[PDB]
Design a binder for this molecule. Structure first.
Ligand code: CL
Ligand code: CL
Ligand code: CL
Ligand code: MG
Ligand code: MG
Ligand code: MG
Ligand code: MG
Ligand code: MG
Ligand code: MG
Ligand code: MG
Ligand code: MG
Ligand code: MG
Ligand code: MG
Ligand code: MG
Ligand code: MG
Ligand code: MG
Ligand code: NA
Ligand code: NA
Ligand code: NA
Ligand code: NA
Ligand code: NA
Ligand code: NA
Ligand code: NA
Ligand code: NA
Ligand code: NA
Ligand code: NA
Ligand code: NA
Ligand code: NA
Ligand code: NA
Ligand code: NA
Ligand code: NA
Ligand code: NA
Ligand code: NA
Ligand code: NA
Ligand code: NA
Ligand code: NA
Ligand code: NA
Ligand code: SR
Ligand code: SR
Ligand code: SR
Ligand code: SR
Ligand code: SR
Ligand code: SR
Ligand code: SR
Ligand code: SR
Ligand code: SR
Ligand code: SR
Ligand code: SR
Ligand code: SR
Ligand code: SR
Ligand code: SR
Ligand code: SR
Lengths: 119, 246, 145, 115
RNA sequence: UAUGCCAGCUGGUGGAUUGCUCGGCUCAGGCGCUGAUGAAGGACGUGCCAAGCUGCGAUAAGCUGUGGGGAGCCGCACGGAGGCGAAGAACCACAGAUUUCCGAAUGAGAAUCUCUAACAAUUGCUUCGCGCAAUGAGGAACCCCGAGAACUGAAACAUCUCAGUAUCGGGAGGAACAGAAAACGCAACGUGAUGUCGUUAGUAACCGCGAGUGAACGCGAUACAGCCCAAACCGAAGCCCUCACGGGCAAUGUGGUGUCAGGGCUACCUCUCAUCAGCCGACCGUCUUCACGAAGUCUCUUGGAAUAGAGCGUGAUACAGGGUGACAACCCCGUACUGAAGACCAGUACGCUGUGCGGUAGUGCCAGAGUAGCGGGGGUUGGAUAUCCCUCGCGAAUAACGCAGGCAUCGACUGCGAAGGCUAAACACAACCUGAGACCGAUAGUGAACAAGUAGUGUGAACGAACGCUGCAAAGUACCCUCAGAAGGGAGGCGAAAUAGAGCAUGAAAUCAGUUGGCGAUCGAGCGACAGGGCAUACAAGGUCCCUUGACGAAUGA
RNA sequence: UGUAUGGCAAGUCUAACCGGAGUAUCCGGGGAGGCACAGGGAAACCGACAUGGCCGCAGGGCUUGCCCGAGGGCCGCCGU
């Protein structure tokens, strides 16, 4: 709807299968041309480059993708705890760009390559 | 008077008689009244729950306990308008008629007057529209209705030295107040009105501040948004002719 | 600014003493209370008067004055122009939902008119004939006897 | 206060004429037009035919209506005429706006107020 | 200078204010029954850890299939441990399995348990056996049939009013009810089932003729649709159960004919496309869900962060809305366009099968009784003599008759066939789905943005609150000192900010601690207004002021 | 029932509702019906000054007191 309350509500209360679209990131120029898509559902295998936070400019492998909080963990994009331990600093996929893909899955690869359905 | 017709390239292509209605004396008061009505007539009825604050058997103790005769329940004041959690004394009411009537003749007169304000370049500029042109309204060939791409209309507007207005409307304002919480965060300047004859221009509609309309049903609000006369308009040769007998 | 808008701060909002605006006592009873007692003034006096005949036995005539007919002679060019001949039945509005058409004699007749209607007033005949005109009673008009 | 922009101009023009030219009627008509609408003149042709005379402009500080018959060849000037009034008047004479009258006769001579 | 007064400053307390919205409120569109095949509701269980909510049912936050979906997952819920998923999990749609006890609650009984085969109870059919079936109870309101106040108004009050309202009993449905004239009575050479909407109209009518109450015909619309018995004349030519055999029903009449364009019968003309029964069975449209889906994440500056400013550039049948570390068409979801599915329209329209319309002549063969109608007594209604109904009593005709047309009787005229029955559509409501908003914005708006009908109150019926906000990211404070100490304190670390460190954005007033200025232990009380002195004063946002003299010089005036 | 403003004017307004569309807005249509255009009378029933006289404000005219004088005022007269 056009109402802000319903818009935010449908986004926060979206079922698991609908949360995949909340972890989508734009593709690099090459990848866009190769698959005929502007963006993709970030996977825990893809390589990504940070374009917005304090980590803008850094690249790394996506180590985790949490659908519940619709956020991602990327290698070396971390914060140092008080005890010295190093923990990940979650990222919103919209502040990120996919530079390499993990196509170990036949289904994902087939999904990306087809013209009718995106991925 | 005579209006100059323009082709899809922006070059002069003959001219036609500007219909008599455009000579109708500009009447901002009548136009404003007509707009006030259209705006009111779309407002939805509202009102608080008729039983709000009344769902309590609260009673007053009366005299004897050194307290005000205010209805209480479980030691809490209830129901009365001065009591927190009590009823609303004179709240909005659903039964209220929020519509405004307007005589057909009086409204039609305003439509004609708004049409005429469109023919005065000084007025159109006074309203706020940005454009480098002497003639107004802008008249174009019926082939305009065949355009498909928004950008092909941009080319035409630039060629007609009327695109400056779209730049003016290409600035959204984030309103002050709680309208934001109800879906009314943005607002923007009103730009060009495109009046065609068969179907509203799909190609011109997404233009910043643009409004599309058809000659048989274009209204006072199309011609004078917010009640302000003199909107920068662009008719279609056929539209310009049909708008004559309104 | 309106009167209402100026009331905040007045306490009484123009009611005088704050003891005034209470219940129906301030009105002398609800509605038409006291119409024969404390508030009898300017009130139609009590009582019955006359009678009414049944609505389906009542006749409703459609009337028109010679003045209206005469002032629009040239305009009524869609009606016969003899040595003007006019059937009033085609002139009067509401003639459909009326039992008959009657021509009354208010005003002047500055032309020679040949009027056809279901009835005419004495003055209507005097005036029409007086300006060299004639009055023609319809078949339905053939009741007076 | 008046709401019609054109009525306001008319009154301002009537005043300007009365002050600048030798007019007194225009200023008279202006004061009356400044009064509430219900007091404004609503005159039918019958009254014009009865009190008007040729070569003396009829001035109506209001609006002229179509009831009655006008035979005299008179120039009638008013704030507004009904569609029928203007038609009947133009047949035997001439209907003119109070604005034209101020232009042709700013001195306001040989004219009769009718209401 | 103590006790202390006034104002302020630093820190509290408090939670106003401003900003924010997971909730409300209201409108609109769609849709609409459930239950003995045991519903709705409740109880008690059910998780590795499990109190609450949500889910589920001993197969217990779940099992199976199909399609979708996808590299993650294990609800709200951001822990730990462990586990599941490419044998395609999660999640979603559709379908199915499981589904304790109480509950209409139905074997008997019982405060959710117990006792010894159960449709308890009332009915229909009946193989007379619970063998086959029905009922019961629920549902936001709407709807239909019954029972039916008072406060109040009349400035008292009784008729009247509030009002057939509140409330009670019974009952159906997705809508109900009504409905094919013993009509209307713009009286007509006229209308033509019924609702409903607009109007007729506050009109006619009622009424301590007071206060008040209050239609209809018609008209303009919406939607439109007309039929079935009883009887005549036929007389078993019939119906129900069963696969069949067979059984049951039915001469107290199954079945044919027939139903006011009356019918039947006898004698004819002609024709059917009416009707009724049944088969087939949508388009379009509407509501919803879903697929697809354009174009920048470029430079510089500032910043913790660029969606900012400046510069350059792009799409647009897409410049609705939302999200993203600040104002985003072009970063993400979406949005336009096009397409797909389900639901409703509707088992309707159309088409089809069977049936057969209709007209003449004759025939007093048939056509609904405690009725029509009248009287007594009530109620009700605008119904007045002329509303509708109840009750007591009386009581007809037979179409060659009868009823109606707003008093009665008789005649005339016009209309119409009661005392049998069915009937789609157009209209009410809002539970449920979706959408919308010049509505409210946490003492508001729901009682409820939170544990909400929660906590809590009452024997019970019933009553009933309050509680929103760390941060960009938990980076949710390591190590050390102190201490009885996982307390607290100190130091320290993180962050733009801890005066963001847990009811953790902002942080008013009342008010409290400390402190600054002024006053203060010989002096008097609406706390001040206006004049004038003391003391006090960082900047900014005000820059004037004092004295000599001179010029001007009103009233007044030496 | 007043009042101010605005449209139209011997008329004026549409109601329900219908079509369109940019789909609660809006454009077109819809005059059923209401009020106004005649009154008086319980009713039956009958049915009026588009001006006949005199004052005279505003305004106009003139040769500057004298004319024409809407509205207004006092009468006639007309309908019942
Ligand atoms: Cl009568
Ligand atoms: Cl007049
Ligand atoms: Cl009729
Ligand atoms: Mg692809
Ligand atoms: Mg409240
Ligand atoms: Mg504000
Ligand atoms: Mg039992
Ligand atoms: Mg009383
Ligand atoms: Mg009564
Ligand atoms: Mg009903
Ligand atoms: Mg009394
Ligand atoms: Mg009543
Ligand atoms: Mg009737
Ligand atoms: Mg039969
Ligand atoms: Mg609250
Ligand atoms: Mg705080
Ligand atoms: Na309550
Ligand atoms: Na007190
Ligand atoms: Na309303
Ligand atoms: Na008072
Ligand atoms: Na003390
Ligand atoms: Na539904
Ligand atoms: Na739990
Ligand atoms: Na189940
Ligand atoms: Na049973
Ligand atoms: Na049995
Ligand atoms: Na009283
Ligand atoms: Na009393
Ligand atoms: Na009474
Ligand atoms: Na009629
Ligand atoms: Na982003
Ligand atoms: Na009744
Ligand atoms: Na009786
Ligand atoms: Na009748
Ligand atoms: Na609160
Ligand atoms: Na001082
Ligand atoms: Na009419
Ligand atoms: Sr979750
Ligand atoms: Sr969660
Ligand atoms: Sr006492
Ligand atoms: Sr007063
Ligand atoms: Sr009271
Ligand atoms: Sr008296
Ligand atoms: Sr009519
Ligand atoms: Sr019909
Ligand atoms: Sr019968
Ligand atoms: Sr009679
Ligand atoms: Sr509070
Ligand atoms: Sr510290
Ligand atoms: Sr002096
Ligand atoms: Sr109209
Ligand atoms: Sr007079």
């Amino acid at each position: 709807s056009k109402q802000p309350d319903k818009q935010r509500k449908s986004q926060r209360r979206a079922p698991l299968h609908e949360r995949h679209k909340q972890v989508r990131a734009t593709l690099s120029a090459d990848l866009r041309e190769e698959y005929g898509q502007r963006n993709v559902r970030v996977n825990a295998g893809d390589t990504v480059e940070v374009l917005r936070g304090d980590f803008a400019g850094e690249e790394g492998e996506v180590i985790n993708v949490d659908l519940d909080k619709a956020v991602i963990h990327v290698e070396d994009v971390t914060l140092e705890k008080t005890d010295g331990e190093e923990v990940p600093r979650p990222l919103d996929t919209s502040n990120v760009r996919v530079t390499d893909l993990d196509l170990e899955d036949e289904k994902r690869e087939a999904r990306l390559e087809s013209e009718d359905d995106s991925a | 008077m005579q209006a100059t017709i323009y082709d899809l390239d922006g070059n002069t292509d003959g001219e036609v008689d500007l219909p008599d209605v455009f000579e109708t004396p500009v009447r901002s008061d009548l136009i404003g009244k007509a707009v006030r009505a259209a705006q009111a007539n779309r407002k939805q009825d509202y009102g608080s729950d008729e039983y709000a604050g009344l769902r309590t058997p609260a009673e007053s103790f009366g005299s004897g306990r050194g307290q005000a005769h205010v209805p209480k329940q479980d030691g809490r004041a209830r129901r009365v308008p001065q009591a927190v959690k009590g009823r609303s004394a004179h709240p909005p009411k659903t039964e209220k008629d929020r519509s405004l009537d307007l005589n057909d003749k009086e409204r039609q007169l305003a439509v004609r007057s708004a049409l005429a304000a469109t023919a005065d370049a000084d007025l159109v500029a006074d309203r706020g529209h940005e454009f480098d042109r002497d003639e107004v309204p802008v008249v174009v060939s019926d082939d305009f209705e065949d355009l498909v791409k928004t950008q092909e209309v941009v080319s035409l507007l630039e060629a007609l030295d009327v695109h400056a207005d779209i730049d003016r409307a290409d600035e959204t304002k984030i309103k002050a107040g709680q309208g934001s919480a109800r879906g009314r965060k943005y607002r923007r300047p009103a730009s060009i009105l495109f009046v065609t004859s068969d179907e509203p221009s799909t190609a011109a509609r997404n233009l910043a501040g643009a409004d599309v309309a058809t000659a048989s049903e274009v209204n006072t609000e199309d011609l004078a948004p917010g009640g302000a006369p003199g909107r920068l308009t662009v008719f279609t040769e056929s539209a310009l002719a049909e708008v004559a007998e309104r | 600014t309106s009167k209402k808008k100026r009331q905040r701060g007045s306490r009484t909002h123009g009611g005088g003493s704050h003891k005034n605006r209470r219940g129906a006592g301030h009105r002398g009873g609800r509605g038409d209370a006291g119409r024969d007692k404390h508030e009898f003034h300017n009130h139609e006096p009590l009582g019955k008067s006359g009678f009414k005949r049944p609505q389906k036995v009542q006749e409703e005539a459609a009337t028109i004055d010679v003045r209206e007919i005469d002032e629009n002679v040239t305009l009524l060019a869609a009606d016969d122009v003899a040595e003007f001949r006019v059937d009033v039945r085609d002139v009067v509005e509401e003639a459909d939902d009326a039992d008959y058409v009657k021509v009354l004699g208010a005003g002047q007749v500055r032309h020679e008119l040949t009027l056809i209607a279901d009835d005419f007033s004495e003055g209507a005949r005097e005036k029409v004939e007086g300006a060299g005109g004639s009055v023609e009673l319809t078949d339905l008009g053939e009741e007076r006897q | 206060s008046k709401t019609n922009p054109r009525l306001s101009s008319l009154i301002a023009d009537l005043k300007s004429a009365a002050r600048s030219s030798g007019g007194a009627v225009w200023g008279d008509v202006a004061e009356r037009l400044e009064k509430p609408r219900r007091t404004h003149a609503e005159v039918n042709l019958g009254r014009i035919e009865r009190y008007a005379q040729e070569d003396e402009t009829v001035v109506v500080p209001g609006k002229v209506l179509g009831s009655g018959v006008l035979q005299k060849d008179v120039t009638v000037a008013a704030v507004d005429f009904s569609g029928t009034a203007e038609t009947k008047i133009d047949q035997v004479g001439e209907a003119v706006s109070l604005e034209q009258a101020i232009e042709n006769n700013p001195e306001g001579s040989h004219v009769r107020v009718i209401r």
